[PDB]
Design a protein around this nucleic acid. Structure first.
Length: 89
RNA sequence: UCAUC
């Protein structure tokens, strides 16, 4: 873990490919986010996702190809909103 | 991992 409970804005997230990027609000740098790194998914949606432009809170770790987000939630640990491309329950 | 579901 390189940083804990960092706030960020999802740059974009591709539901079909299962990944995207988050822009850190502190450093304004992008970090990779994989679908499996989402800790609190939207219980009202199917599939694992975050939605473009959403505010998220996460840890930062060193990944294979640059820094990565893990333990992704909404701010204060609440569920994420998820992607418009992820179907609703 | 910069995609364009």
């Amino acid at each position: 873990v390189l940083a804990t409970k960092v706030l960020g804005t999802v740059k974009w997230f591709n539901v079909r490919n299962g990944y995207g990027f988050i822009n850190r609000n502190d450093t304004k740098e992008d970090v990779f986010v994989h679908q499996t790194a989402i800790k609190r998914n939207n219980p009202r949606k199917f599939l694992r996702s975050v939605g473009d432009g959403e505010t998220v809170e996460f840890d930062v770790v060193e990944g294979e190809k640059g820094a990565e987000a893990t333990n992704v939630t909404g701010p204060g640990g609440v569920p994420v909103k998820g992607s418009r491309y992820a179907p609703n329950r």
